[PDB]
Amino acid sequence: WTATSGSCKGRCFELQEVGPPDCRCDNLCKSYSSCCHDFDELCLKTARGWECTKDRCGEVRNEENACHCSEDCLSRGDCCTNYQVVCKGESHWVDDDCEEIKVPECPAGFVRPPLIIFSVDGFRASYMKKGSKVMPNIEKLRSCGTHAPYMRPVYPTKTFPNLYTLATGLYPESHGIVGNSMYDPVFDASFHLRGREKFNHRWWGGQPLWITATKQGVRAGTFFWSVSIPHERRILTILQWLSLPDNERPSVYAFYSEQPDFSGHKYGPFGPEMTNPLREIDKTVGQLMDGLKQLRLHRCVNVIFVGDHGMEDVTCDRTEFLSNYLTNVDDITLVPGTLGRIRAKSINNSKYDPKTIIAALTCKKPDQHFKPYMKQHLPKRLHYANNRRIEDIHLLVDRRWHVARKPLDVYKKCFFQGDHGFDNKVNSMQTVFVGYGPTFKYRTKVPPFENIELYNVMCDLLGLKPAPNNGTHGSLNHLLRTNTFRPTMPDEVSRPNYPGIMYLQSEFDLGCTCDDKVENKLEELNKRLHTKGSTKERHLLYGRPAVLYRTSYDILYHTDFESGYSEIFLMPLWTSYTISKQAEVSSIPEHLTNCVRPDVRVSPGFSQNCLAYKNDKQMSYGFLFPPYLSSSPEAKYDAFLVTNMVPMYPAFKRVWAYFQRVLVKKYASERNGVNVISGPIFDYNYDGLRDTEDEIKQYVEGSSIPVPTHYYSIITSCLDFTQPADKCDGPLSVSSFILPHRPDNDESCNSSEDESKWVEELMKMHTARVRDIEHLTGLDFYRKTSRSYSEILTLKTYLHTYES
Numbered sequence: 164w165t166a167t168s169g170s171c172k173g174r175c176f177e178l179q180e181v182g183p184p185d186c187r188c189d190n191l192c193k194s195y196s197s198c199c200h201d202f203d204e205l206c207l208k209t210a211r212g213w214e215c216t217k218d219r220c221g222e223v224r225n226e227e228n229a230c231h232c233s234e235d236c237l238s239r240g241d242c243c244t245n246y247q248v249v250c251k252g253e254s255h256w257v258d259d260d261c262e263e264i265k266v267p268e269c270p271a272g273f274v275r276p277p278l279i280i281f282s283v284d285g286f287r288a289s290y291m292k293k294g295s296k297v298m299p300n301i302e303k304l305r306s307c308g309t310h311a312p313y314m315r316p317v318y319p320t321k322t323f324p325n326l327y328t329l330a331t332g333l334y335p336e337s338h339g340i341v342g343n344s345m346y347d348p349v350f351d352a353s354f355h356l357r358g359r360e361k362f363n364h365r366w367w368g369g370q371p372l373w374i375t376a377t378k379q380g381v382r383a384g385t386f387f388w389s390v391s392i393p394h395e396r397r398i399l400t401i402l403q404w405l406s407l408p409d410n411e412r413p414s415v416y417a418f419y420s421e422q423p424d425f426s427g428h429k430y431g432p433f434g435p436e437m438t439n440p441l442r443e444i445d446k447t448v449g450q451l452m453d454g455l456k457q458l459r460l461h462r463c464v465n466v467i468f469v470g471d472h473g474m475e476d477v478t479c480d481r482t483e484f485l486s487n488y489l490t491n492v493d494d495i496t497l498v499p500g501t502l503g504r505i506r507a508k509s510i511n512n513s514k515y516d517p518k519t520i521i522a523a524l525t526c527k528k529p530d531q532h533f534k535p536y537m538k539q540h541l542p543k544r545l546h547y548a549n550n551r552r553i554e555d556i557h558l559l560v561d562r563r564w565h566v567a568r569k570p571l572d573v574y575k576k577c578f579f580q581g582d583h584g585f586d587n588k589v590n591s592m593q594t595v596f597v598g599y600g601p602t603f604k605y606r607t608k609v610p611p612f613e614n615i616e617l618y619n620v621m622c623d624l625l626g627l628k629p630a631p632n633n634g635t636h637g638s639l640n641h642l643l644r645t646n647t648f649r650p651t652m653p654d655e656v657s658r659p660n661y662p663g664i665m666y667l668q669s670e671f672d673l674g675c676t677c678d679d680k681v682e683n684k685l686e687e688l689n690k691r692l693h694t695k696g697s698t699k700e701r702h703l704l705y706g707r708p709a710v711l712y713r714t715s716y717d718i719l720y721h722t723d724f725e726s727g728y729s730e731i732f733l734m735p736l737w738t739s740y741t742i743s744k745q746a747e748v749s750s751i752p753e754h755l756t757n758c759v760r761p762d763v764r765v766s767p768g769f770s771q772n773c774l775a776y777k778n779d780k781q782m783s784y785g786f787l788f789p790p791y792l793s794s795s796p797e798a799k800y801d802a803f804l805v806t807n808m809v810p811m812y813p814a815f816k817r818v819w820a821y822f823q824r825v826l827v828k829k830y831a832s833e834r835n836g837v838n839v840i841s842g843p844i845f846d847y848n849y850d851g852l853r854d855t856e857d858e859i860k861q862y863v864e865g866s867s868i869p870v871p872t873h874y875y876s877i878i879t880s881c882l883d884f885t886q887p888a889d890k891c892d893g894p895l896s897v898s899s900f901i902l903p904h905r906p907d908n909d910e911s912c913n914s915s916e917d918e919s920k921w922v923e924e925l926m927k928m929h930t931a932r933v934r935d936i937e938h939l940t941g942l943d944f945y946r947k948t949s950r951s952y953s954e955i956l957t958l959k960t961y962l963h964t965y966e967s
């Protein structure tokens with residue numbers, strides 16, 4: 164019930180929301196069917212439209228007009244945005260040269276530069292170049308301010324997950340808005356774009372910027388706008404709020420446009436019908452800037468122009484149907500489109516089997532345009548698993564395609580030519596970022612970055628302490644002139660032991676053998692030196708990683724590599740080695756094929772054993788430092804230490820051997836040396852965070868050797884590739900991966916072929932940020948470089964994406 168017979172007189176676009184049954188006058192009242200009877204009349208005036216003309220200049224104030232051209236309008240805060248242009252011979256903001264804004268130039272009574280977020284739905288990154296002729300206001304912001312060539316959205320590249328990620332700094336799995344449609348089995352409730360359940364606050368986790376602001380005494384405009392409020396009125400409302408007295412006036416605001424998404428869906432991303440929506444967004448930006456200039460705020464306000472996601476060409480004829488694969492197609496519920504999510508139709512069906520559905524969808528047709536995954540097998544970079552609303556079965560749909568249950572779903576629901584929602588590495592899904600204002604840099608290009616980082620920066624812009632989030636605070640300091648947040652490196656929690664030779668060979672009963680019985684004082688002192696770390700500067704280029712949790716581990720030095728060996732997990736946490744451009748690849752000698760050697764620095768009881776691998780018929784073993792890249796025949800024996808061994812499924816060894824034998828050398832040739840850090844990851848509860856021992860769900864049969872869910876590598880070199888990796892004086896270049904440790908290669912449809920036709924494609928799919936590896940391992944990398952910490956943070960957030 165709403166008692167709609169109250170009034171909005173003096174309350175239009177009120178900031179405090181009032182409780183039912185009292186009638187409302189705020190931004191969102193329309194969307195709740197709760198506005199007072201007179202809201203249209205009083206708050207949505209349209210008479211005479213939105214622009215002053217010469218003949219209105221100095222008019223007698225008429226309160227019926229949408230906006231005003233009378234002499235009192237500036238003091239009332241309600242001039243048409245062009246008032247001073249038409250009636251006082253001022254220039255439009257876009258016609259003025261840009262001038263660096265070195266300090267905020269604010270009216271008296273402003274305590275901080277306000278922040279205005281101009282958000283645009285479906286604004287694909289390439290519009291900045293391809294639409295530039297029709298967007299002069301946006302182009303001036305972009306060239307005069309700070310801009311990235313694009314900004315990476317989160318997966319799925321849908322509207323609600325991305326807007327709320329922008330507002331919270333959180334991954335959808337953590338904020339809870341995991342799609343445009345959702346089922347929550349604990350609630351037993353359904354969330355959709357149409358209708359009322361979505362207004363219940365229980366869906367919306369984390370803490371959005373407007374709540375952060377309000378809890379810390381910074382006032383906020385309401386961010387949301389009901390669709391029938393025209394854009395011109397949204398701008399006027401923002402500008403009116405900015406004329407409020409100091410104690411009432413917000414410091415943070417948001418504008419939102421449904422365009423160009425709305426048109427992009429109908430006409431496709433570059434349909435000729437798209438020039439007009441882009442023109443109109445630009446005009447809106449011009450209105451805001453001219454309005455701010457009127458208020459003498461155009462060199463005071465920080466403005467962010469930001470998109471939620473891009474838009475791709477998709478048509479009804481590019482739909483895959485699950486009825487062409489499954490027999491039982493009515494025993495499932497599919498959330499469909501540019502992604503697929505599958506669950507049982509009825510929780511009273513014990514004949515539901517996910518395993519059989521996965522097999523029925525896996526590599527069934529030769530050009531298949533989707534790939535099924537159990538959610539825990541999705542690429543870790545998507546961070547799309549740790550939520551009860553994300554269904555166990557997921558379909559990653561190829562760009563330009565849809566998935567649907569049956570053809571009848573597609574014609575009893577071609578209309579559309581555009582859609583989005585695909586993998587967030589896809590070029591067509593990328594979106595835009597521009598920052599303009601006193602606190603942003605002047606005419607500065609910055610590298611592409613992920614939208615999860617922006618919440619921290621918006622908090623910095625407003626002097627707020629961010630709530631706990633998935634940004635890496637400091638990684639975007641290079642966007643800012645001032646207000647930088649000065650992060651410190653985390654403190655190492657566990658210090659390593661440095662074991663010397665403490666055990667005789669015969670103390671070991673590991674059931675391992677090696678043909679290594681081959682006896683010189685010149686080379687005897689030398690090998691001692693290598694074991695004490697004489698080559699460590701070569702192989703550990705950026706310091707040892709720091710261990711940020713409580714544990715027991717040893718540093719082990721060797722000629723060709725250094726490792727941090729966990730007494731708890733019985734294997735290295737990390738293994739570091741450097742491969743120069745000139746290094747040679749060799750084979751494992753025939754005599755050493757099954758060689759595993761006890762490590763006399765590490766007790767039998769904190770060692771793996773070969774017998775467990777023999778008895779475990781599913782599980783084999785591999786090595787972290789590759790025997791193929793040994794620097795000499797003698798150094799090669801170090802690679803067969805039991806302390807360099809890790810459990811590997813035979814199917815995974817095909818991948819790992821190819822990486823170690825072929826790809827490491829290839830990268831060293833291309834990048835002029837590389838430093839590699841590799842290791843295991845345990846994430847059995849798929850939360851993106853390092854498992855404790857008591858969370859491990861699988862061990863090598865008969866043992867306490869835990870089985871990794873993934874293996875990582877971090878591959879670093881000099882950004883200036885004319886310098887070798889091991890003598891780089893400037894910034895670094897990194898690529899990383901987190902490969903799933905799987906017993907089959909069902910993910911790779913071409914895996915019966917040679918590794919050269921499929922392994923690298925797999926690795927590219929599982930590309931990662933260093934930061935992703937940090938969360939999964941409790942390690943902190945790049946602790947000792949010549950680089951500034953903010954720059955290192957930026958490097959740790961880089962994702963190598965493999966798009967053109």
Ligand SMILES: *[C@@H]1O[C@H](CO)[C@@H](O[C@@H]2O[C@H](CO)[C@@H](O[C@@H]3O[C@H](CO[C@H]4O[C@H](CO)[C@@H](O)[C@H](O[C@H]5O[C@H](CO)[C@@H](O)[C@H](O)[C@@H]5O[C@H]5O[C@H](CO)[C@@H](O)[C@H](O)[C@@H]5O)[C@@H]4O)[C@@H](O)[C@H](O[C@H]4O[C@H](CO)[C@@H](O)[C@H](O)[C@@H]4O[C@H]4O[C@H](CO)[C@@H](O)[C@H](O)[C@@H]4O)[C@@H]3O)[C@H](O)[C@H]2NC(C)=O)[C@H](O)[C@H]1NC(C)=O
Nearest residue numbers: 336337338339367368369549550551631632633850851938
């Ligand atoms: C990205 O950034 C985010 C934010 O920093 C990271 O997520 C955080 O990670 C922490 C570790 O997983 C986690 O900390 C736990 O929080 C518990 C309290 O949680 C509530 O209160 C906070 C505070 O305001 C709130 O934010 C939470 O919000 C979640 O849940 C609500 C619904 O209830 C949702 O609206 C919201 O979207 C959010 O859901 C997401 O997170 C939850 C986990 O909380 C997931 O389950 C969801 O799927 C979704 O992803 C909560 O309202 C706290 O109780 C925990 O403490 C337990 O563990 C410690 C270990 O030391 C133990 O000693 C304690 O005894 C305790 O255990 C007891 O309970 C167990 C569970 O029932 C039980 O089994 C035991 O036997 C014990 O009885 C813990 O501190 C933090 O909440 C989330 N925050 C958010 C916002 O998601 C995220 O990790 C980052 N991602 C990456 C990749 O880095």
Ligand SMILES: Cc1nnn(Cc2cc(C(F)(F)F)ccc2CCC(=O)N2CCC(CSc3ccc(S(N)(=O)=O)cc3F)CC2)n1
Nearest residue numbers: 280282323326327329330361362364367386387388417419
């Ligand atoms: C989704 C979403 N997430 N965050 N925003 C705000 C936002 C963030 C940013 C940002 F700065 F973050 F970039 C910029 C701009 C916005 C405004 C977006 C907006 O007016 N749109 C149109 C209105 C539509 C109503 S739907 C709705 C409302 C309230 C609630 S409630 N009761 O508050 O839980 C629930 C709802 F489902 C949502 C999307 N929208």
Ligand SMILES: [Ca+2]
Nearest residue numbers: 846852853854
């Ligand atoms: Ca985990």
Ligand SMILES: [Cl-]
Nearest residue numbers: 321342343344
């Ligand atoms: Cl969805």
Ligand SMILES: [K+]
Nearest residue numbers: 776779782783
């Ligand atoms: K075995």
Ligand code: NA
Nearest residue numbers: 908909911914
């Ligand atoms: Na396969």
Ligand SMILES: [Zn+2]
Nearest residue numbers: 285322424428
């Ligand atoms: Zn859309």
